[PDB]
Design a protein around this ligand. Sequence first.
Ligand SMILES: *C(=O)[C@@H](NC(=O)Cc1ccccc1)[C@@H]1N[C@@H](C(=O)O)C(C)(C)S1
Ligand SMILES: *C(=O)[C@@H](NC(=O)Cc1ccccc1)[C@@H]1N[C@@H](C(=O)O)C(C)(C)S1
Lengths: 234, 247
Amino acid sequence: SITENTSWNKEFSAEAVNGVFVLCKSSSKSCATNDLARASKEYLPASTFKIPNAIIGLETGVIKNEHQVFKWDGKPRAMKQWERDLTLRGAIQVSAVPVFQQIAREVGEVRMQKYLKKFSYGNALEGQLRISAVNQVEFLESLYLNKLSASKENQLIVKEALVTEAAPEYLVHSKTGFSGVGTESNPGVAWWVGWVEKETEVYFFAFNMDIDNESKLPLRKSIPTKIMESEGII
Amino acid sequence: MGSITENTSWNKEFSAEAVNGVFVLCKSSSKSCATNDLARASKEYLPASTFKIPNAIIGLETGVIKNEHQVFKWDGKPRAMKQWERDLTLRGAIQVSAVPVFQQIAREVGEVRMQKYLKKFSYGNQNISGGIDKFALEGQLRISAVNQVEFLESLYLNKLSASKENQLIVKEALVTEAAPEYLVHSKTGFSGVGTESNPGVAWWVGWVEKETEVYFFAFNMDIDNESKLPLRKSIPTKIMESEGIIG
Ligand SMILES: *C(=O)[C@@H](NC(=O)Cc1ccccc1)[C@@H]1N[C@@H](C(=O)O)C(C)(C)S1
Ligand SMILES: *C(=O)[C@@H](NC(=O)Cc1ccccc1)[C@@H]1N[C@@H](C(=O)O)C(C)(C)S1
């Protein structure tokens, strides 16, 4: 059950942004959003696909365990932070695409296909697979509860890998995504998805927006944060 | 672990704050450690609230703690610290260091089961005198800085005598700082003021995952005054900053 909240439309209007935020307490059986229509509309997952990819990599034993080191082959890559040896968390945090391209190559298209169906994930950083903000939140819940078709052990490994902010009374698991600058008529998409544990409570969130100007990128974080802080979540 | 060397240039931070204590830093890839005082690095002290680490692992391995999603319900009755007067998760109870919660956990485990596990963990001098809720805080169990890093490294590598699953749960519950380049797991401890001429102890233990490297650490100091307590963290941080680990 998803319900519409117009009280935050001042932020989207002031920033000239077309996007959607979905935030749920306890269980994804009652969520809130700024745009009902967009909440269920499906966009390219971009780098948020690293989450299911990592689970599948470990399930198939392509990634041997949590302590796996992905050696850099020494060839130039697209960004500097990727030009080094990386751990699972390292590769997820700097978002090193070639590391995860290589994992998926070994997994094979047919195996990946199957597990995705199994996870109810969705319909690459540009392909044929798309996912909604409602879909993302339902998937992240299952991961938190250990409910995915995967060993409990492997879901825990990816759960720790996704930790982005830690405090004595709250913990944040999250991942950004960004498909690239687009046209006014063919815009890119930016993502931030995750969940917050606070007190004995748990909050699931997923945000996306169109992006035709690169400098509008920080708003994928500032807007969801303005909201979540106003709710007393962080 | 593998090797240890005395590095006396760390004593600067110690003399500055008038602190009588020790710091042990180990680098995982090369199995080697550095410390400012070889002798205190080997001396055994009360584990205090660092015992919550083995206590949490055993709590799970025996069914007493059901899983990672269990809530420890407050009865509405006043507790020794304001911080403790609420329902806590496993991470919650560990982060605010809620003594009565882990004492109840210890009670349910039992005398014989608690012994058997500390044996397999190689935890300290292995003794549980005074009562089944007294030994860690003010009893007869003792452990050294060197022993703490050995214990913590086993846990990191999932090598302790428990399920991988359970070792992972406690590992997440111990996360205290998170940046894009590094992640810190840690726990504090503090026995009390003791007396003048017979002080109490304060600990900081953990490990830092950073790049492909991992760094285990343990710190402890003599303490008789509560105002010195922040130093249990500010000194080890200083040492680790100048070595380019955190911050
Ligand atoms: C996931 O989207 C990844 N993005 C790309 O590889 C496309 C791209 C777009 C602009 C510049 C370079 C590459 C990685 N994840 C994002 C993100 O998390 O924001 C990066 C921009 C780090 S690349
Ligand atoms: C672990 O040592 C715990 N310490 C005690 O319960 C002993 C104590 C000392 C003074 C007053 C009351 C109880 C926990 N660790 C410390 C700490 O982290 O500062 C606490 C005082 C929070 S209890």
